[PDB]
């Protein structure tokens, strides 16, 4: 749950909820940098009757900063910010 | 899964909807992962490049360019389509991406990072048109059988 900063170079995942039919619809995810340049684009259309959809994105070429992730279902748009960092604290 | 059902000999076409099938056979159907091969990663503005890829389950394909907006079509050919061989492969070599009339060409004519995608020509149109539609939004491009790649156009070197 929540937002966790991602160390660049590894794999990041996003989990979201939707009410759309899985097969006939799809969710588009766009990742942009601080300047808004498109750095990653992913989509999915597979989720069970739990309404949870998970999308995986690579962070190899990502810079460090508050990147923006936008999810579009074709009717509504949701935006979020995640701090991509070189390395985390653990 | 999809099934074919044989019916009793001598039955009429209209009446056959009621009676149960004498026998049936089932089989599975899967989608085709159309994708591009040549245009990816680095590219030089104004340089002619080859276009090739696989278009399984497709007869014609179209190419679109995107930068923080809708996908714009490129006037590569007269019909804006590329035929697919019997091997589910399409190719159109030695085309100038930056030397086209479409807005995607102008977008690719300025140095920067962009996205280039391929879509099915049958899924390209959204209004019953006999040809490829000029512009498609993100949802229309994603819904149909399509693929995308990251491109980066840079300045010339001598």
Asked if the C-beta of A36 comes within 8 angstroms of chain B's C-beta atoms, the answer is yes
* Cα separation, A70 vs A41, whole angstroms: 10
Paired sense of beta strands B41-44 and B146-154, if any: parallel
B22 touches chain A (CB under 8 A): no
Is B135 in contact with B73 (CB distance < 8 Å)? Answer: yes
Quick one: chain B helix, strand, coil %, rounded to 5? 15, 40, 45
From the CB of residue B55, how many other CB atoms can be counted at a distance below 10 Å?
Answer: 27
- Data resolution in angstroms: 3.5
- Asked whether the beta carbons of B156 and B45 are under 8 A apart, the reply is yes
Q: Given A28, A36, A37, which is nearest B138 (Cβ)?
A: A28
Taken in order B43, B49, B53, B57, the sign of the CA dihedral is: positive
Nearest-CA neighbor of B71 among B142, B151, B120? B142
How distant, in Å, are the alpha carbons of B120, B122, B134, B140 from that of B126?
12, 9, 10, 8
**Facing residues of B120 across strands?**
B61
Contact A29, A69 (CB under 8 A): yes
> In which order are the strands placed within the sheet that holds B35-36?
B35-36, B48-54, B89-96
Contact A38 B139 (CB under 8 A): no
Among the partner residues A28, A36, A74, nearest to B68 by beta-carbon distance? A36
Cα separation, B32 vs B37, in Å, equals: 15
């Amino acid at each position: 749950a929540g937002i966790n900063p991602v160390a660049t170079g590894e794999t990041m995942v996003i989990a979201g909820s939707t009410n759309l039919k899985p097969d006939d619809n799809t969710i588009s995810i766009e990742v942009t940098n601080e300047d808004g340049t498109s750095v990653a684009l992913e989509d999915t259309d597979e989720w069970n009757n739990d309404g949870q959809w998970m999308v995986e994105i690579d962070t190899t070429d990502f810079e460090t900063g508050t990147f923006t992730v936008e999810a579009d279902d074709g009717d509504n748009t949701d935006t979020v910010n995640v701090e991509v960092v070189s390395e985390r604290e653990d | 899964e999809v099934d074919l059902e044989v019916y009793d000999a001598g039955v009429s076409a209209t009446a056959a909807v009621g009676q149960d099938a004498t026998n049936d056979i089932t089989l599975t159907i899967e989608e085709g992962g159309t994708t591009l091969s040549s245009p990816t990663g680095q590219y030089v503005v104004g340089s002619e490049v080859d276009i090739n890829g696989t278009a399984t389950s497709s007869d014609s394909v179209a190419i679109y360019v995107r930068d923080d907006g809708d996908w714009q079509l490129l006037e590569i050919g007269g019909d804006n389509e590329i035929s697919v061989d019997s091997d589910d492969t399409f190719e159109e070599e030695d085309i100038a991406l930056s030397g086209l009339s479409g807005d995607g060409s102008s977008i690719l004519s300025l140095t920067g990072t962009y996205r280039i995608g391929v879509i099915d020509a049958s899924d390209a149109d959204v209004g019953g048109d006999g040809s490829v539609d000029d512009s498609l939004t993100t949802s229309e491009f994603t819904s149909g059988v399509s693929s995308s790649n990251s491109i980066r156009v840079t300045d010339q070197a001598l």
